[PDB]
């Protein structure tokens, strides 16, 4: 019956496909003039159309490389694979979509690179001493998580130039500590010391050879060193298939981009490598500090994990900086760097506890929506990341690619990759805009009857004036002609009053606004909805009274964002654990909760009624969390069985409950004892007592 295909696709085969993915064309002359030329695939068959002469392209997404997921990262046999599939060919027809899927695994026993980038200001003299044996001491703990481990070393202070440096008296240059009654190395921006090696002893050796320097003002130039350690891939020696950890150790605030102007340095950081044979950052005196955006871009590309190991006095600072460079982790460092070891280990586990997907080179007219299956089979819609993972775990993501219109390009390739991973899914997208029958087109006249029009795909379409089925009438004045059924009925007006019916068809009036199309001039290029004075909220194209939303917008008005970042809590939890993110805004579900991310809930039950489930789950193998098999994931706090309860310490919340065995269980929990969270249980629950 009358559909969208038979009212918009009748113009031509290319536009027939352009109408709808469900449309089909007919290239057979046998079909007499009167029946539709663009219709459903079935309807064309039903109208006895030659199956060979039917143009019906189908969108597909076939996998080209489908390597399985590795079980061990130390696999020297086959190349380690942590993402499947690896390559997909996507082919789309106008305004069509095609969904696909990807599996990401946190592979057990993956290789690790650790570059130790160290502040060597005078305050770090004691730190430099405590890490003399750090190497071997580190190699042991890392052995528990990986077999193949390389480490390296690098140091920084600040740009060897005024005002950051002492340049007078002449003795201050050779020894910045001339007045402090001792000696320290002259100022240096960044020097690479030890290229990433598996010879752990080399670390200890090189560290003991190091010595500190001294800066004039408090902020230093670590950002220079961070950049250089990131993009000088060869010098540092990052391995392709290895987790990259860049440990940044400092006890002071830092210079940022544009600070360099005081020094007479106004050339913006190029993000390129500038550490040569001498192993010193040569651009230090001529190039400004890198901006946070630049550092982010390069860290993301080179798959480097920045770890901020800073002292108490500057923690909050670097914490706030970290929130501007996503994926970066911050740890609290002691004044002598005694706890740098556990900091690194704690950071590593944090790093491999999450999987977030990123997209590179995504074509303009192409949109991607995500679903995330992180836990069991629970499908989280509109999410492209998972958290609270353990090494060995595997998450899944469902992806849909939809094209708006049909960009007549050649071939485009984009990348869906998990952040910091080497492996990736490469998508080759191809667009089937026009029909194959258009290649064998005929320029003009000749075959298209006695007229001088044009003929392709078994159909004709004349030029200016000629509106006949096969080049009939001229520039009007050709009598009433056909009069035709230029309307869905006959008692209705002709051509939607937006044109006159000339020669068995409609000729739509012009409009200053935009374009009027359609078989009956019923298509409007500018009558789409409005949200705030703008059409389609200024985030969508108007197509025959319909809004075709832009790559990150949805809804009938094109005013609903697909973003989730504005729904993330301080917990890294979407709308805390209390609601869902609809249009970049948290809609709170948890009874009596509110706030931009549902953070506020003063009438929610005390924390005891939640931690209890973990105690029943972890320590008694029962409860709701057990039944749903979410114990390991949701209950991550350490739960230690204790003899008695204490009164000493701070923040001791006494929680009690009666279990299925009618025994009174008592438990207390610590919070930020040191960023951690403990939970003690009295090992002897109060039970009834027999005779008897």
């Amino acid at each position: 019956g009358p559909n969208i295909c038979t009212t918009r696709g009748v113009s031509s085969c290319q536009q027939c496909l352009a109408v709808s993915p469900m449309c089909a064309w007919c290239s057979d002359e046998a079909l007499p003039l009167g029946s539709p030329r663009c219709d459903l695939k079935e309807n064309l068959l039903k109208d006895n159309c030659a199956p060979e002469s039917i143009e019906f392209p189908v969108s597909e997404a076939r996998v080209l490389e489908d390597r399985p997921l590795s079980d061990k990262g130390s696999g020297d046999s086959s190349q380690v694979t942590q993402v499947s599939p690896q390559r997909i060919a996507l082919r789309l027809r106008p305004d069509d979509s095609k969904n696909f899927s990807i599996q990401v695994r946190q592979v057990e026993d993956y290789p690790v690179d650790i570059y130790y980038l160290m502040d060597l200001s005078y305050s770090m003299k004691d730190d430099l001493w405590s890490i003399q044996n750090l190497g071997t001491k580190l190699a042991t703990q890392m052995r528990k998580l990986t077999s193949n481990l390389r480490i390296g070393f690098g140091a920084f202070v600040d740009k060897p130039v005024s005002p950051y440096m002492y340049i007078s008296p002449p003795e201050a240059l050779e020894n910045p500590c001339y007045d402090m009654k001792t000696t320290c190395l002259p100022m240096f921006g960044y020097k690479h010391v030890l290229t990433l090696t598996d010879q752990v002893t080399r670390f200890n050796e090189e560290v003991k050879k190091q010595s500190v320097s001294r800066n004039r003002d408090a902020p230093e130039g670590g950002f220079d060193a961070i950049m250089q350690a990131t993009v000088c891939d060869e010098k540092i020696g990052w391995r392709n298939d290895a987790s990259h950890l860049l440990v940044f150790t400092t006890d002071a605030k830092t210079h940022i981009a544009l600070d360099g102007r005081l020094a007479g340095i106004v050339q913006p950081n190029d993000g390129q490598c500038h550490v040569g044979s001498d192993n010193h950052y040569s651009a230090s005196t001529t190039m400004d500090y890198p901006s946070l955006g630049l550092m982010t871009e390069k860290l993301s590309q080179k798959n480097i994990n920045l770890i901020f190991a800073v002292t108490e006095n500057v923690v909050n600072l670097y914490q706030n900086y970290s929130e501007l460079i996503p994926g970066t982790t911050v740890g609290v460092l002691s004044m002598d760097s005694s706890n740098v070891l556990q900091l690194i280990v704690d950071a590593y586990g944090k790093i491999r506890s999450k999987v977030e997907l990123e997209v590179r080179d995504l074509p303009e007219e192409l949109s991607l929506s995500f679903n995330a299956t992180c836990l069991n089979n629970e499908v989280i819609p509109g999410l492209k990341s998972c958290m609270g993972l353990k090494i060995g775990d595997t998450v899944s993501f469902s992806i849909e690619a939809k094209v708006r219109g049909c960009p007549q390009e050649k071939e485009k390739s984009f990348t869906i990759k998990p952040v910091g991973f080497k492996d990736s899914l490469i998508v080759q997208v191809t667009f089937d805009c026009d029909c194959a029958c258009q290649a064998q087109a005929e320029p003009n006249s000749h075959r298209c009857n006695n007229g001088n029009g044009t003929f392709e795909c078994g159909v004709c379409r004349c030029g200016p004036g000629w509106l006949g089925s096969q080049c009939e009438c001229s520039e009007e004045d050709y009598r009433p002609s056909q009069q035709d059924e230029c309307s869905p009925r006959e008692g209705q007006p002709v051509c939607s009053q937006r044109g006159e019916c000339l020669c068995g068809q409609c000729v739509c009036h012009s409009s200053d606004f935009g374009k009027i199309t359609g078989k009956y001039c019923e298509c409007d290029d500018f009558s789409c909805v409005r949200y705030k004075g703008e059409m389609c909220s200024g985030h969508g194209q108007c197509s025959c009274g319909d809004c075709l939303c832009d790559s990150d917008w949805t809804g009938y008005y094109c005013n609903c964002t697909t973003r989730t970042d504005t729904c993330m809590s301080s917990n890294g939890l979407l709308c805390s654990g209390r609601g869902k993110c609809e249009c970049g805004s948290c809609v709170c579900i948890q009874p009596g909760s509110y706030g931009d991310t549902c953070e506020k809930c003063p009438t929610c039950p005390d924390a005891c009624t939640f931690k209890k489930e973990c105690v029943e789950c972890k320590k008694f193998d029962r409860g709701a969390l057990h039944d749903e098999n979410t114990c390991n994931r949701y209950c991550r706090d350490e739960i230690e069985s204790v003899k008695e309860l204490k009164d000493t310490g701070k923040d001791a919340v006494n929680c009690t409950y009666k279990n299925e065995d009618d025994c009174v269980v008592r438990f207390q929990y610590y919070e930020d004892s040191s960023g951690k969270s403990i939970l003690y249980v009295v090992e002897e629950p109060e039970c009834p007592k027999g005779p008897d």
């Binding site: 005024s162 005002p163 007078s168 008296p169 004039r216 003002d217 408090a218 605030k253 940022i256 981009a257 544009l258 600070d259 005081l262 007479g264 106004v266 913006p268 946070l292 955006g293 982010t296 706030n320 900086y321 501007l324 997209v359 200016p464 520039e475 009007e476 004045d477 006159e500 000729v507 009036h509 012009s510 409009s511 009558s527 909805v529 409005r530 705030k532 004075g533 790559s551 990150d552 964002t561 973003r563 970042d565 009874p591 009596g592 509110y594 003063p602 009438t603 039950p605 005390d606 005891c608 009624t609 309860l645 929680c655 009690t656 009666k658 009174v664 008592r666 109060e686 009834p688 007592k689």
Partner: protein, 929 residues
């Protein structure tokens, strides 16, 4: 939008000298000539033994683009002793800042180093040079005997500079006092009069200067940038400075009183490391004589469409009000890493429209990163956030980014054409370029057709050639033009006329001119500046009845006017420009006589009505409001019939409904024309006789505008007919209503207590919480979810205080969160306890009650009031409760009553509800079975 980009003046300096790092105009009062001033911070000079001392070049504008170095100082380093220099001018970056007020030029060397006279040093105090004709003094406030970093040793004074209106210098020194930064202002008179070449540390009398502060303010870089303007009563320029590292690199902008360096207002950035305060500017952007603040944060990261951070830079625009409060909006860059906001240059009134304009630079934007400069026009409502012109760098890099836009300067009509011009610096390629503003012309066109209604049977005038007569009409078009400033007397316009525009491209040409016999006709035209609305007539006829069939489609007469501006250029080839908000064309339309009665005139009978929707508009939120209209023409045909729905400010037009297949899908549009907001819907052209329409117009009315009765829509149909052209106007009132979903909820923490209490010993005279029992928290929340707000409410808490002389839940202390005060009818915590770090129900009905009453203020949508009641379980009571083992449910209850609303002239209704909160005290040990 009016800046010439075809023929801009291009100036050049020595390569590597950073020619263009600083720019300004030189407008001396001793001459009728004007010049360009360009700083070349790294320029080599003839100063003996000085490498890259830097210089400032004066550039001629009349013809030859020649640049001459100004001779501030030809001497090299002065000596403290033999082979012991007192100063070091090499790499001093002289020219890094340049300012000029009339005959006086101030230039600075922010990297000038100084030995001091106490010890061998090399401290960058910085120095400046003030020149006036031939006299040259050296201003160097930071070069004092307060040395080292804790003092003004590393001040780098002159890093940024500016003059005030009363001839007073403002100077920035980012390095003073451990890089806290410093502002120092001196009278130009004293800077000159007190100069003494034999004194290296001159003290000026009327000096204003910020002073050292606490060490938490260190490394803030006060004086990184400076601008001046008035921000209080007196007409004295106050001091505005950027402090980009302030507040943990959030960045700040300080404003000091121009009279006595007193602090006035502060601004604070919102994203760390964004370098908020890198550039500042002050200019009145909305023509209200109140200077407005512009702040640049070139490394700001906004959130992309994907949701990811992206460095695009941001500019803060703060409109000053007579109140003292600023009205601030924000403005983001367009390219990543382009550093939009690196330079903000006021232009004065670039297009002479009555409001000042401003230029913002993204010196690393554009393809090939050559540099972009965006122009923003001002208006009454503030700054128009959409740039009217982009300026693209024309030079590619060599070893450094061209940095086109890194420095700029405007507000100086250098060719005296009535329009201020603009200098842009590109120090990366040692280039500076001057863009001249083109004169702006405001032209209003006229078009009328006689007669409007064509009668095919009225063959009046003869057709040239044949003996036939035709039904003809007159087409008269008019052009008047005028523009401020310097621009030609006569103007050449290329006007072209088109008959039946909406009916071409293969359709039939339905109306022709008398001679050309075509729908098209062009015409050269030359009008005079002012009010001479020069007009020209044409005679267009109409094809014979048989020639065509269509006679309902109106005949649209189209007129467009071009401009031969390639001819109207000045001597130097500065072509004029049209006002961007003026339409280059205009349309009128004639209609053919059809079904207009015996009198040959169409007299319609238009009438419109709106169905009583009975919908209420609840104050507080956005309300879906769909008005249903019936527009009927119970008379003759109404040409250009339009439905005019004039709507109130509180309303926005969503669109015409289309889901209903029994409702006409009209073609409507929203226009803000004049000071009236209204919706316009096409009802047919012509809306034929007897025609009747039913349409739905969806609206959304955002309210919460306090005391009002209702909102009204006015509807009227109007046509372009001569008789009965409109319909009676119809008003439609929709009542405002009040609705407040107010709820109260509670909770106990814990909600249960198991007996016996561990380690609990009975003390006859209790002192601590530990001595009494466990802590029990009851939290009560009164929250207003509903759209409407309420102004006053009462909260009543009933607390189970005692059961037969036994204390139960002993209240220690209660806290409050929100607009409410509370009062307990009994003394809270009588025993002064402090430290830090079959189940029977005991309600207030069967127990001694402690009442807590609370008065609640205004709770708007989404707001709430919270009562935290912290109590202790009186363990003694439950142990020797005559006997031990028993199960008790301690019940407290809270009710609320909303008593007042702010919407006084509207039907209200008191709101009441309540909840209860229990704490169950039971025995986990059951000695049975």
């Amino acid at each position: 939008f009016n800046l010439d980009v075809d023929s801009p003046a291009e100036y050049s300096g020595p390569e590597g000298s950073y020619f263009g790092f600083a720019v300004d105009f030189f407008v001396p009062s001793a001459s009728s000539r004007m010049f360009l001033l360009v700083g070349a911070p790294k320029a080599n000079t003839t100063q003996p033994g000085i490498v890259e001392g830097g210089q400032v070049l004066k550039c001629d504008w009349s013809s030859t683009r020649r640049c001459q170095p100004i001779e501030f100082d030809a001497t090299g380093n002065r000596d403290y002793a033999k082979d012991d220099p007192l100063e070091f001018k090499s790499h001093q970056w002289f020219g890094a800042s340049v300012r000029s007020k009339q005959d006086k030029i101030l230039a600075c060397a922010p990297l000038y180093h100084w030995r001091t006279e106490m010890k061998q040093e090399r401290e960058p105090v910085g120095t400046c040079f003030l020149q006036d004709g031939t006299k040259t003094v050296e201003y160097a406030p930071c070069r004092s005997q307060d040395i080292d970093a804790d003092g003004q040793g590393f001040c780098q004074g002159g890093f940024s500079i500016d003059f005030t209106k009363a001839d007073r210098v403002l100077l920035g020194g980012p390095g003073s006092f451990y890089w806290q930064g410093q502002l120092i202002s001196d009278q130009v008179a004293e800077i000159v009069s007190k100069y003494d070449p034999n004194v290296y540390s001159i003290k000026y009398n009327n000096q204003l200067a910020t002073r050292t502060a606490q060490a938490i303010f260190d490394d803030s870089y006060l004086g990184y940038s400076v601008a001046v303007g008035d921000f209080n009563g007196d007409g004295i320029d106050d001091f505005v400075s950027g402090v980009p590292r302030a507040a943990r690199t959030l960045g700040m902008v300080y404003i000091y009183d121009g009279k006595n360096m007193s602090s006035l207002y502060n601004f604070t950035g919102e994203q760390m490391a964004a370098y908020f305060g890198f550039s500042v500017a002050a200019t009145d952007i909305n023509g209200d004589d109140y200077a407005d603040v512009f702040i640049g944060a070139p490394l700001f990261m906004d959130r992309g469409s994907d949701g990811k951070l992206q460095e695009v830079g941001q500019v803060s625009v703060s409109l000053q009000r007579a109140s003292g409060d600023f009205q601030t909006t924000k403005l983001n860059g367009f390219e990543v890493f382009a550093r939009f906001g690196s330079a903000i240059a006021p232009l004065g009134d670039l297009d002479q429209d009555g409001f000042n304009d401003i230029a913002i630079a993204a010196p690393y934007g554009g393809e090939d990163k050559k540099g972009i400069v965006y122009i923003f026009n001002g208006r009454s409502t503030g700054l128009n956030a959409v740039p009217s012109q982009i300026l693209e760098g024309q030079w590619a890099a060599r070893s450094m980014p061209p940095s086109f836009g890194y420095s700029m300067k405007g507000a100086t009509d250098i060719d005296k054409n009535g329009y201020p011009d603009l200098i842009v610096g590109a120090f990366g390629v040692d280039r500076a370029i001057l863009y001249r503003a083109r004169p702006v012309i405001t032209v209003n066109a006229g078009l009328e057709v006689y007669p409007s209604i064509l009668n095919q049977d009225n063959k009046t005038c003869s057709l040239p050639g044949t003996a036939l007569k035709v039904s003809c009409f007159n087409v008269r078009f008019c052009l008047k033009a005028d523009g401020k400033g310097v621009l030609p007397r006569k103007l050449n316009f290329q006007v072209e006329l088109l008959l039946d525009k909406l009916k071409q491209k293969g359709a039939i040409r339905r109306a022709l001119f008398l001679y050309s016999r075509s729908p098209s006709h062009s015409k050269n035209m030359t009008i005079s500046r002012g009010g001479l609305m020069q007009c020209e007539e044409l005679i267009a006829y109409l094809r014979d009845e048989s020639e065509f069939r269509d006679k309902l489609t109106p005949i649209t007469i189209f007129m467009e006017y071009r401009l031969d501006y390639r001819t109207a250029a000045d001597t130097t080839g500065l072509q004029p420009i049209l006002n961007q908000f003026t339409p280059a064309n205009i349309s009128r339309q004639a209609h053919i006589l059809l079904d207009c009665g015996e009198d040959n005139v169409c007299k319609p009978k238009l009438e419109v009505s709106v169905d009583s929707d009975q919908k209420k508009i609840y104050i507080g939120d956005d309300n879906p409001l769909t008005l249903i209209v019936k527009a009927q023409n119970q008379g003759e045909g109404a040409y250009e019939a339009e439905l005019i729905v004039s709507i109130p400010l509180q309303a926005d037009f969503i669109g015409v409904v289309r889901n209903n297949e029994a409702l006409a899908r009209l073609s409507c549009a929203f226009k803000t024309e004049n000071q009236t907001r209204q919706v316009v819907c096409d009802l047919g052209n012509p809306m034929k006789a007897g025609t009747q329409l039913l349409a739905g117009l969806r609206f959304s009315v955002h309210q919460q505008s306090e005391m009002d009765t209702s909102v009204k829509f006015d509807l009227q149909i109007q046509s372009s007919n001569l008789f009965d052209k409109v319909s009676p106007v119809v008003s439609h009132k929709v009542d405002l209503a009040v609705l407040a979903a107010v709820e109260i909820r509670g909770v106990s923490s814990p909600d249960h207590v198991f007996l016996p209490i561990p380690n609990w010993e009975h003390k006859e005279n209790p002192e601590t919480e530990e001595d009494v029992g466990p802590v029990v928290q009851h939290i009560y929340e009164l929250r207003n979810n509903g759209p409407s707000s309420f102004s006053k409410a009462m909260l009543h808490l009933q607390w189970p205080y005692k059961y037969n002389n036994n204390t139960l839940l002993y209240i220690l202390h209660y806290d409050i969160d929100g607009p409410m005060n509370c009062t307990s009818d009994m003394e809270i915590n009588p025993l002064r306890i402090k430290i830090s770090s079959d189940i029977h129900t005991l309600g207030c009905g069967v127990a001694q009650c402690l009442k807590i009453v609370c008065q609640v203020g205004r709770l708007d949508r989404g707001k709430s009031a919270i009562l935290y009641v912290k109590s202790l379980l009186w363990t003694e009571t439950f142990m020797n409760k005559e006997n031990q083992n028993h199960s008790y449910s301690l019940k407290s209850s809270a009710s609320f009553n909303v008593i007042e609303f702010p919407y006084k002239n509207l039907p209200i209704e008191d709101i009441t509800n309540s909840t209860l909160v229990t704490t169950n005290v039971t025995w986990g040990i059951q000695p049975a079975p």
